[PDB]
């Protein structure tokens, strides 16, 4: 185990401590999970004492993974992304090809160059391991071998990998130690948030049979993820920042409900 003697991490940990909302933190500490309301908008319902809340779990997982990243900095486990199938490898140049505005090989190469020069630290501090399969200068052959393992029983979806690389290469201020470190933790947290699952019409006979069971499977995987992995972690360690009050909304209360719903 590695002690973080770093001055940058401490300032960022203090910044989290200064934003902690005591009352909102108690709500998460004692949550009673109800279920998923919207997999697209990412709304989940929780019970706290006598109230029913609508939570934006996109926003909560964001702060949760950010907080986990801050705490386990330089001591992360790894999600080994490589199999025996070499064709399943994650090439950074291939990911950046999703961005039409990166209309030239050079602009994609610009992003990979920054990321690649910082591979020693990205690996050491974040467990973000990048490897080169050919000659060192071949940016088009730069690969993502490992990602940090933030939560046991959780493997993030890689649908957002293009955004992760694009933002690591364009949004992270590599010049300032603190801003750079904060930026990477934010990028890891953003990638780690469960995906937005758009609504698909199960009643529409016009939509194919294979597209149905596939939506149903994505719907199930999130419900299971939130219920068995995410909410138990949120309940156990989540510190609620005050900027999240807008993301937690009281929708019903038992005293009021029991004035309408009555025994036979």
């Amino acid at each position: 185990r590695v002690n973080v003697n770093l001055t940058s991490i401490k300032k960022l940990r203090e910044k989290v401590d200064d934003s902690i909302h005591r009352e909102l933190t108690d709500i998460f500490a004692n949550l009673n999970y109800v279920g998923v309301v919207d997999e697209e908008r990412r709304l989940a319902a929780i019970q706290h004492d006598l109230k029913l809340f609508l939570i934006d779990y996109g926003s909560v997982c964001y702060e949760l993974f950010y907080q986990i990243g801050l705490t386990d900095f330089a001591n992360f486990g790894k999600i080994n992304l490589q199999s025996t199938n070499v064709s399943d490898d994650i090439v950074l140049y291939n990911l950046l090809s999703e961005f039409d505005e990166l209309n030239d090989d050079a602009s994609k190469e610009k992003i990979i160059s920054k990321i690649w020069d910082m591979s020693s630290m990205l690996n050491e501090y974040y467990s973000i391991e990048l490897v080169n399969d050919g000659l060192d200068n071949d940016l088009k052959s730069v690969k993502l071998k490992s990602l940090p393992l933030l939560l046991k029983g959780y493997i993030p979806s890689l649908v957002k990998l293009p955004f992760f690389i694009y933002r690591l290469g364009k949004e992270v201020d590599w010049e300032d130690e603190q801003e750079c470190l904060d930026g990477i933790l934010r990028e890891i947290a953003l990638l780690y948030i469960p995906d937005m699952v758009p609504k698909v019409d199960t009643s529409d006979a016009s939509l194919s049979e294979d597209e149905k069971a596939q939506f149903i499977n994505r719907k199930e995987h999130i419900s299971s993820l939130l219920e068995h992995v995410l909410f138990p972690c949120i309940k156990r360690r989540f510190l609620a920042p005050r900027h999240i009050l807008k993301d937690v909304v009281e929708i019903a209360n038992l005293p009021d409900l029991y004035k309408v719903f009555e025994r036979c």
Partner: peptide, 7 residues
């Protein structure tokens, strides 16, 4: 302290 990677 400060990071070796930022010099």
């Amino acid at each position: 302290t400060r990071s070796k990677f930022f010099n």
